[PDB]
Amino acid sequence: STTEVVMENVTAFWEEGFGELFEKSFSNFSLLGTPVLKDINFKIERGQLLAVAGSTGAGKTSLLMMIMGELEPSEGKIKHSGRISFCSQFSWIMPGTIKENIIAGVSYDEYRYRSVIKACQLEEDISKFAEKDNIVLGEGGITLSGGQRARISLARAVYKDADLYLLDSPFGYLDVLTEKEIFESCVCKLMANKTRILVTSKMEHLKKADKILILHEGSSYFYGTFSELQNLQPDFSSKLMGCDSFDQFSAERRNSILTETLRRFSL
Amino acid sequence: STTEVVMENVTAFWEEGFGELFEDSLSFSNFSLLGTPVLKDINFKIERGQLLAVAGSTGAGKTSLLMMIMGELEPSEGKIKHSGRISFCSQFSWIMPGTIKENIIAGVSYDEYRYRSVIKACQLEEDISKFAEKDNIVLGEITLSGGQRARISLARAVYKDADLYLLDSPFGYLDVLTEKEIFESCVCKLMANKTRILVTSKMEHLKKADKILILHEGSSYFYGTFSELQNLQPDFSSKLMGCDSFDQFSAERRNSILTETLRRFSLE
Amino acid sequence: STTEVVMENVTAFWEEGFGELFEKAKSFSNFSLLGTPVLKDINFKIERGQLLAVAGSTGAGKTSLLMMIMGELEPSEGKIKHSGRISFCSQFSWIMPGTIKENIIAGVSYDEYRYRSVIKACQLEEDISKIVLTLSGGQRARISLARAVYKDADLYLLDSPFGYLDVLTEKEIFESCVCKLMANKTRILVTSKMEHLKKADKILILHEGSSYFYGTFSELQNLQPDFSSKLMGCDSFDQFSAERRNSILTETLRRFSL
Amino acid sequence: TTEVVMENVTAFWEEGFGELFEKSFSNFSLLGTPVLKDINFKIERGQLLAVAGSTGAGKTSLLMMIMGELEPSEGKIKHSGRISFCSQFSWIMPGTIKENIIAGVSYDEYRYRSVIKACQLEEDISKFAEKDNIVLGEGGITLSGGQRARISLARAVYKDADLYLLDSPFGYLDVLTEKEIFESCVCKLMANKTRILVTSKMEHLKKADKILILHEGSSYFYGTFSELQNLQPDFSSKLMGCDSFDQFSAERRNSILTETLRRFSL
Amino acid sequence: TTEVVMENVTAFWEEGFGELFEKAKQNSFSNFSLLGTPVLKDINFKIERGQLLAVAGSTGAGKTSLLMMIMGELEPSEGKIKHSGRISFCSQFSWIMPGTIKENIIAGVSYDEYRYRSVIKACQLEEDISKFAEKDNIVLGEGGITLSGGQRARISLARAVYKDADLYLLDSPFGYLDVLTEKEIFESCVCKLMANKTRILVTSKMEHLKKADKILILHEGSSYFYGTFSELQNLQPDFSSKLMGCDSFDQFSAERRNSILTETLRRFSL
Ligand SMILES: Nc1ncnc2c1ncn2[C@@H]1O[C@H](COP(=O)(O)OP(=O)(O)OP(=O)(O)O)[C@@H](O)[C@H]1O
Ligand SMILES: Nc1ncnc2c1ncn2[C@@H]1O[C@H](COP(=O)(O)OP(=O)(O)OP(=O)(O)O)[C@@H](O)[C@H]1O
Ligand SMILES: Nc1ncnc2c1ncn2[C@@H]1O[C@H](COP(=O)(O)OP(=O)(O)OP(=O)(O)O)[C@@H](O)[C@H]1O
Ligand SMILES: Nc1ncnc2c1ncn2[C@@H]1O[C@H](COP(=O)(O)OP(=O)(O)OP(=O)(O)O)[C@@H](O)[C@H]1O
Ligand SMILES: Nc1ncnc2c1ncn2[C@@H]1O[C@H](COP(=O)(O)OP(=O)(O)OP(=O)(O)O)[C@@H](O)[C@H]1O
Ligand SMILES: [Mg+2]
Ligand SMILES: [Mg+2]
Ligand SMILES: [Mg+2]
Ligand SMILES: [Mg+2]
Ligand SMILES: [Mg+2]
């Protein structure tokens, strides 16, 4: 099964102190703080892809955290139901095998597991190891490349059967071509009929999305389709540079991207 | 089973030299001005079984106050009253070489009921059952997440049967929801009849506490209940932002919070 | 984990005075005759993970048997064997002040996966998605069951939890909840429905405090082809309260409107 | 605390038959019926008197006479000091749980915490984020019957008095909670105080220092439980005034069930 | 969404024999009904809400007829049939209407942008529509002229799936596709797009039987087997092509085989 997600006039603070103060001669104590999310409105139907974009600190992860209940609204309405699956910006590797890391407590299913490792391009990493997917890794994933950790992390999120998938920029340690292929095979094909929210800065991902949400300083800059945004603002393509770009990338990230490029052509 | 904690006009210096210095028509000197006390004129009283929340910004002397109760820091003036054994959970989550079970038990006599009640309240059942070796898998001084280490370190402090529990911000590496759940199940439920002092910046924790103590640069800013303080200072919610906020968190703290979030939606 | 439940030659009195008099009795006298035991010579065994259906006419002692297991009622004679935690769903659908989450969680620790599973099995997913507690009779019934089912226990005692539901919703929840989600748990279900007795590993029929039948449904069908609604303690719809009737109707409307 | 003495006490609820009893032979008092007749007992400081009898026997009326609502036409009543009264009716004031328990007298944190412990109100208070200071209205809406019963007893017990009059305060509780609170509150916390408890429970009679059985306003039995067992091995639910569960209101049965549910869920 | 239940169902296509079976049922004795042969005899199965039933069996076993009975064209002479809601039907015959591809898929029912897009993706029609100059608005005549067999099959499936129904009856919709495309569409359409819908799929593919929640094997009008694929394989380790109704490639028409070849060519030439 899958779920709708609806937000109506949502405002939220990470600080518990400022939240209560917002819910209240005159005075205005709320001003001493700043809302992380302000007047958020959207509705995504069952099985749709919502792409969320915006510059650093805009509140993209925070929006996901609010769906997950870590951040609570001080105003407005959130509607969604069922199980959540989360893929974080941080790729987390569990002590155990690659199979164990993907399955993560869920019952093993042959067809599902194979679909997922195929979609996330782990077949060559899963067979060309000493003892297949039974090789033991530790917490952190020292013996794995950044690209491997990202793909295992995505595989784990996609293997879980859920009503809502929250994907926080899962391709950032991958090279361009691998990102394009996995977006298509995983997010567009394997997850085709699951409601999903993807944090991304890729214009292509926005193009394929059913709905887009541009966040600016916690506020809704634009909600609708990419075509509508392009028609109103033919310049926006340039503002997409002011989101997540190279040279601002850390050292290990660039090295991971290079390693993923090397993997492609070494075959 | 549990102790009262009293402090009367307590002033203290970490530096022994400035402490010794501490204890107009005519000529006078004032050498004690050369040093600043870490704690100054501290007064509070916590009854048996009560919860005291201690808050304040970085460097205000919260850990130092706990250190004083432990006898690491010594008073130059005033009296400190507390009896029985002390248990201490630090900001630093310490992992002993050995197993998880031995890490929680750590010398203290083994009891089946108590141990299982502790690992439940600290949400360690799922961590213990997942490993092939159960709670008999070996650890160094790592292949553990920040959240796991924090949970084990709390479990250890809680397992010990003591008259006074000192909890120095034990939830920092946990996500919001896990923190809420463990505060309720461990601090509030399993430890309900125990005297405990909790260093925290969370409004909810201050609300639940019987008494609160707000420290400012080593001095008592407020002592009483949270309601009394909110009634006196409708501002205070804003002051609590200037305590321990996300903007200062290190990378490994931020990432520990994130994988605790992952754990909830990926495991069990 | 889960537990076995054993009852050997059990007799019990709700009135302590008559209970203690049976113990004192344990030319001649028989002062114990002045009272009447609520349960008399009860014998059954339910294996770990099995379902016991308890049926019988109004006042036969179905709830009291559950109260005895919970220790509210004490035996004057015999042995009762059960270990671990008990979870109880009453005929009364209790709603606490607080949220729906707080009502379901009710003093045990929150677990995300388990929570979502229980919401699914009790058909509360749409209800929950739509705040202090407003509710339909059906919603109250489902939340109250969800609470009992959410608690991790060795033994589940379910006292007629489906009464305020329409036939179709009761069937679906008995399947998803009692049969599937709770498949490996020891459960005792007070019910009057043929389908439930068919599915149970064992059935106990009570009559005026005594054991009328113990065994399987198929064994009962041979010995009693003459169905009795009175003896089984079946629903008398014309005697249902206006509240109960309208709850059943509302649940029927819900199926076809939402 | 106080002693309670009653010597040859007879009383009428109606003022008319009062002085008529206090008076050719004529007896106009006969067309009235005395609610209590020739009552005799003596309970020492710190002792528990258990009072039992069928419905309408005069158990509550006896408490009412001690409180002064009912005046004797004959005999002597001796008791001194303040009285605390816990009624069959569980009453809730406008205001918070704390204020409901405190009820006017000066706050004492130690005494208060002891009372809420003994009356099992700790989970009730700690559940709310507003704790002790969340408001309730008159009637006790949004509270369960079990909670009202516990708050009402808490109020009665918190009050410092020489004599405590407890009129069947457990009726809306399940068997187990009644047993636990009888023990922790009436038997332990109030062990130093003189108390009179109207009850039907055999267990309460055993723990009492003295028991008084009423029947139609007259003293059927006065003495210990052991003496009563000797004299009367034939237990009678009717005579002891045992609760007929089938005669319970929907709200009372549902209260008991909610208390049962509270125990196994929390 | 709906449940489908059949219990001891018998049916005749010929009305005369159906009425004869019922008239002799209520009533020295006679048995006139033996003169006819029922298309379906003693049918028993159950599929729950949102589940996939796979129906297999040899040619003439009565697979389409069972679908025809659910649709009310064939009437039961005996037994219980339970189902509710709207039915959508995809036939072995790929029907093309006069009109555009859009009109063909929509089929009068209201247009919904997202639903339409979801269906054309799941049925692999995105390439086809875009490849045409006027896109969705290219005019098709009745029957077959302009489109390939694979295209006709995908449009016909898309129409069935676009309709909002509580029961989807899919009578061997992939026969004119190559193996790889059939695999992909069974996954993307039948399993994912229709994941929460009650569906009955007539098929001869082991893969489909494996994925189904329940299978129903038909043999000369009667229930040969009902259960899961695991239960079947445990109770029958010997595979029979004839019994399962496995479509023999030799017994395919020239147009069918060439449609399969065209689909393979499409994959490698675009
Ligand atoms: N766990 C948290 N607790 C408190 N504040 C947080 C937390 N996570 C993020 N924030 C705050 O929320 C605000 C928005 O940050 P957020 O991480 O949601 O931005 P983002 O759009 O995901 O940025 P980026 O593109 O770099 O990932 C920031 O001020 C940040 O400090
Ligand atoms: N072990 C120590 N020896 C000497 N000085 C110390 C020691 N620990 C803390 N201090 C000093 O005491 C002062 C107060 O520090 P303390 O750690 O008690 O503040 P805090 O309230 O716990 O701050 P934080 O919230 O960052 O933990 C600081 O000047 C600090 O350098
Ligand atoms: N809490 C109680 N205290 C005293 N007597 C009780 C109590 N509960 C039930 N009884 C009595 O026990 C006897 C059996 O009642 P019980 O409620 O167990 O029957 P039941 O089978 O559950 O009937 P129903 O179908 O109406 O639920 C009755 O006489 C009833 O009055
Ligand atoms: N306030 C009153 N004013 C006048 N008569 C009263 C009053 N209260 C009780 N009575 C009468 O006193 C008689 C005895 O009743 P009482 O309430 O003392 O019996 P009880 O033993 O408490 O019965 P129960 O077990 O039902 O509580 C009854 O006739 C009753 O009507
Ligand atoms: N519309 C109809 N009217 C009358 N008889 C029919 C009709 N359709 C099919 N039949 C007959 O019903 C019987 C069963 O044929 P049916 O088409 O249902 O088998 P099938 O399993 O679908 O075979 P196939 O694999 O070739 O499609 C045959 O005798 C057939 O002639
Ligand atoms: Mg982010
Ligand atoms: Mg510190
Ligand atoms: Mg009952
Ligand atoms: Mg009375
Ligand atoms: Mg056919």
PDB file of C-alpha atoms and ligand atoms in Angstrom, chain C residues 59 61-64 66 91 159-160 190, ligand 8:
ATOM      1  CA  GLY C  59     -24.112 -14.706  32.874  1.00  0.00           C
ATOM      2  CA  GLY C  61     -19.179 -16.821  33.700  1.00  0.00           C
ATOM      3  CA  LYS C  62     -17.183 -15.911  30.577  1.00  0.00           C
ATOM      4  CA  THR C  63     -15.857 -12.544  31.851  1.00  0.00           C
ATOM      5  CA  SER C  64     -15.422 -14.020  35.346  1.00  0.00           C
ATOM      6  CA  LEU C  66     -11.002 -13.918  32.506  1.00  0.00           C
ATOM      7  CA  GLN C  91     -16.343  -5.491  26.428  1.00  0.00           C
ATOM      8  CA  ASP C 159     -13.737 -10.149  25.941  1.00  0.00           C
ATOM      9  CA  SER C 160     -16.164  -9.780  23.008  1.00  0.00           C
ATOM     10  CA  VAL C 190     -14.980 -14.575  24.322  1.00  0.00           C
TER      11      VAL C 190
HETATM   12 MG    MG F   8     -19.096 -10.851  29.796  1.00  0.00          MG
END
